[PDB]
């Protein structure tokens, strides 16, 4: 209201405006790196998936256990990335419980565990933090997939949810299944195949679990790093739209104080 109140609020939206400009150029140079490193990791991600499409495989009638793998980051400021995958995980668990299956979920990010800490605190298996600061690599896809086996939880189907992006502007939260069990991978479409036993298929079906996580980790760090570019851009337009409206009110009030304290001197001298 007063002149001391207008100036202090005006300076504070200069610093918020300058910082969101600096945090736009930082998270855009992290975006161009994650676009180049995706194309070698795309065909290697496509090729490891490519065996299951050339086979009619589906989890047929009913299986007793389940896994949902929630893939997100350990960072905020990215708009509706984390809210979409938290919306898709609650839709599937409420649908599979109609069939009486026991479901255990695992989150590879902080902000998946922090959202679901209230409703589903007893259906967690493990949680993996410190994800998204440095770029993801294949060794971290092997650390996660190793500890999914040697936990004590022997499961038989599952699925993974992540954000495969279409462009700079529009992404999409998607769904992909994980045939982890050897015997559901023992169907009519494998009897045509060669001398693979239940020991060779045991080693092979494990390795495709580490190739679906590395596929999931590369698309989701591009979906997140592009939404940090947009959501830090509208936070500098709205802070510069607000910074002109307080500049006019600062200038009306600056003139009105020179006018007001000029009248007090004139009225003090005239009455004397």
């Amino acid at each position: 209201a007063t002149l001391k109140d207008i100036t202090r609020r005006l300076k504070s939206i200069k610093n918020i405006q300058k910082i969101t400009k600096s945090m736009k150029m930082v998270a855009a140079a992290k975006y161009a790196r994650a676009e180049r490193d995706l194309k070698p990791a795309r065909v290697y991600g496509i090729g490891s998936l490519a065996l299951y499409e050339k086979a009619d495989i589906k989890v047929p009638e009913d299986k007793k256990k389940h896994l949902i793998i929630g893939v997100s980051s350990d960072r905020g400021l990215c708009g509706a990335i984390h809210s979409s995958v938290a919306k898709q995980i609650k839709s599937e668990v409420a649908n599979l419980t109609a069939a009486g299956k026991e479901v255990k979920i695992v989150g590879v990010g902080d902000k998946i565990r922090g959202i679901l800490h209230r409703t589903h605190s007893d259906q967690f298996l493990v949680t993996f933090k410190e994800v998204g600061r440095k770029p993801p690599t294949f060794g971290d896809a092997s650390v996660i997939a190793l500890e999914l086996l040697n936990s004590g939880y022997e499961f038989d189907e599952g699925s993974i949810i992540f954000n495969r992006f279409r462009s700079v502007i529009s992404y999409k939260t998607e769904e992909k299944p994980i045939f982890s069990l050897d015997t559901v991978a023992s169907a009519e479409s494998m009897s045509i195949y060669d001398d693979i036993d239940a020991d060779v298929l045991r080693n092979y079906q494990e390795y495709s679990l580490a190739n679906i996580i590395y596929y999931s980790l590369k698309e989701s760090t591009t979906s997140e790093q592009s939404a940090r570019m947009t959501a830090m851009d509208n936070a500098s337009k709205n802070a510069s739209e607000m910074i002109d409206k307080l500049t006019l009110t600062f200038n009306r009030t600056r003139q009105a104080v020179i006018t007001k304290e000029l009248i007090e001197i004139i009225s003090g001298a005239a009455a004397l």
Partner: protein, 127 residues
């Protein structure tokens, strides 16, 4: 002075940590003992109009919450708890409040004597 000195210091640690409106970390054992005690201590300080309480009745309300006898109740019912507890002390326990007034201080014989009546009330008030 023996009951409000540890009430002021439990509010001062509440204002510093409860300015978020956007929580991302669940510190359920760490600070939610501190951040959900000061909610009860604040609603203990509300009052109506033209109703000045006596000084010894004021101690029997603050002592009921600073030592932690209200930490189980719902936050919507703390004002309903007090106007039922205000009746139970002024009618059946008059000679207790005659000791807090006339001495001017609360003592160790009176401290454990005051500890039982709030526990018999809370075991009977809830439905």
């Amino acid at each position: 002075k023996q009951v409000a000195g540890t009430m002021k210091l439990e509010l001062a640690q509440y204002r510093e940590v409860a300015a978020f409106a956007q929580f991302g970390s669940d510190l359920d054992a760490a600070t939610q003992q501190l951040l959900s005690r000061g909610v009860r201590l604040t609603e203990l300080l509300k009052q109506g109009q033209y109703a000045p309480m006596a000084i010894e009745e004021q101690v029997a309300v603050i002592y009921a919450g600073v030592r932690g006898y209200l930490d189980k109740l719902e936050p919507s019912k703390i004002t309903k708890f007090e106007n039922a507890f205000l009746s139970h002390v002024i009618s059946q326990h008059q000679a207790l409040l005659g000791k807090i007034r006339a001495d001017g201080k609360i003592s160790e014989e009176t401290d454990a004597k005051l500890k039982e009546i709030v526990t018999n009330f809370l075991a009977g008030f809830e439905a």
